[PDB]
Design a protein around this ligand. Structure first.
Ligand code: HEM
Ligand SMILES: N#C/C(=C1/SC[C@@H](c2ccccc2Cl)S1)n1ccnc1
Length: 404
């Protein structure tokens, strides 16, 4: 009795940091914008696997972002720690979505991100100062890739970096837990921490976005205290984990494509385009593609019924050869325009240009200060995170030429 199914298990795990899982390549190749999958609990759901259809469905308000809905597509038991939890605007639909998102946009404008560049460069070179002073070997994740965005997002939020070991540990536990209880505990750890910060700011107004939300919107009853906690937690976790993963995966990927890494070093005007290509190619945030239909939607002859879960798999859409010629070739010179690594539409990543700024500063700094950087272990020996979380590696051993 054959085991072939027409609803393969989803998600799949990467076997190479920068390649689609074998099962995803299969979905990429199968014609049609949609494909059935089976989630961890046996429920069937749709995945979107082509680029233009992914944009269209991300733009369709009939695909709700409401994670509290019973039919929202959960890809791991740990999701249940989010289904029964208060809801940042990543999980809201218009019109509620806009009222909450606009409370935070002032910290992520182009003018603010520009103003942050000297501060980001200082943080980047500070952690490189310390890592290089100590000499190889080092774990790039714990010594550089994680602390840099953590320090940056703490200052943006007004979260004291002195507490970094606490919330770095909680952030990891929340995002990578494979059971609801572990994720729920980390959620509650972070919430209790953030609730105390709020009360402190009500005594002594503080800097940063959390300080501003306490002094203004909270004081005016325009955001619930618990929504403020959920909102700060979203930005804190998003600010830590995603950028850190782009750094480690970009280093791995660039060292596996030395001709392009050399071309990048030789002409730094290529770095912004290289960042876009790396974002398209590494597409680390499929876990951010879940949707639930609130009405029937006809998609190129296929029918999404009201109440069905839909996952917009931007990593697969980003390998659509009708948009990106030879889509599985890394090409830092190609047009990676219109990639979906940050989503599309009303929920397109609030932090996208901070992430672009941090990756540019980081790649230039590594090429400037550590041109002899190389992995200290074979790529095959790295441990990749599973497809139920943000893609990446939890450790990245590196070495380099030690200058005394
Ligand atoms: C390379 C790094 C990053 C990637 C690949 C990424 C990816 C994404 C994606 C795909 C979405 C859309 C989710 C959806 O449609 O439901 C999203 C939304 C979001 N991201 Fe990021 N992100 C990154 C970095 C950041 C950073 C540094 C922040 C800083 C706070 C951040 C904050 C957010 C927020 C707040 C949202 C929700 C926006 C909304 O619902 O209106 N992200 N991100
Ligand atoms: N989607 C998404 C996304 C997230 S980071 C915070 C994640 C989270 C997971 C489980 C429980 C609570 C929370 Cl708050 S969900 N992200 C990543 C980059 N930009 C946005």
């Amino acid at each position: 009795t054959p085991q072939t199914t027409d609803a393969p298990a989803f998600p799949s795990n990467r076997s190479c940091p920068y390649q689609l899982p074998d099962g995803y390549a299969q979905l990429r190749d199968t014609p049609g914008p949609l494909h059935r999958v089976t989630l961890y609990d046996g429920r069937q759901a749709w995945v979107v696997t082509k680029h233009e259809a992914a944009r269209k469905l991300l733009g369709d308000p009939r695909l709700s972002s409401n994670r509290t809905d019973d039919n929202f597509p959960a890809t791991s038991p740990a999701f249940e720690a989010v289904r029964e939890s208060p809801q940042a605007f990543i999980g809201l639909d218009p019109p509620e979505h806009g009222t909450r998102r606009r409370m935070t946009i002032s910290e992520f404008t182009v003018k603010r991100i520009k103003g942050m560049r000297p501060e980001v460069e200082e943080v980047v070179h500070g952690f490189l100062d310390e890592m290089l002073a100590a000499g190889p070997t080092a774990d790039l994740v714990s010594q550089f890739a994680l602390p840099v965005p953590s320090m940056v997002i703490c200052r943006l939020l007004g979260v004291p970096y002195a507490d970094h070991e606490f919330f770095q540990d909680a952030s990891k536990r929340l995002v990578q837990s494979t059971d609801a209880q572990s994720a729920l505990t980390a959620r509650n750890d972070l919430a209790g921490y953030l609730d105390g910060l709020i009360t402190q700011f009500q005594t002594e107004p503080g800097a940063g976005l959390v300080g501003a939300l306490v002094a203004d919107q909270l004081a005016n009853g325009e955001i619930d205290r618990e929504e403020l906690i959920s909102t700060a937690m979203l930005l804190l976790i998003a600010g830590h984990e995603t950028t850190a993963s782009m750094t480690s995966l970009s280093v791995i990927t660039l060292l596996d494509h030395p001709e392009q890494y050399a071309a990048l070093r030789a002409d730094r005007s290529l770095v912004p385009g290289a960042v876009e290509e790396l974002l398209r190619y590494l597409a680390i945030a499929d876990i951010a593609g879940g949707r639930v239909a609130t009405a029937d939607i006809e998609v190129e002859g296929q029918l999404i019924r009201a109440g069905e879960g839909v996952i917009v798999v931007n990593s697969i859409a980003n390998r659509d050869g009708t948009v990106y010629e030879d889509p599985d070739a890394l090409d830092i010179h190609r047009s990676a325009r219109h990639h979906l690594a940050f989503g599309f539409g009303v929920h397109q990543c609030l932090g996208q240009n901070l992430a672009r700024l941090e990756l540019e500063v980081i790649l230039n700094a590594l090429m400037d200060r550590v041109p002899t950087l190389r992995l200290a272990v074979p790529v095959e020996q790295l441990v990749l995170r599973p497809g139920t979380t943000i893609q990446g590696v939890n450790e990245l051993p590196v070495t380099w030429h030690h200058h005394h």
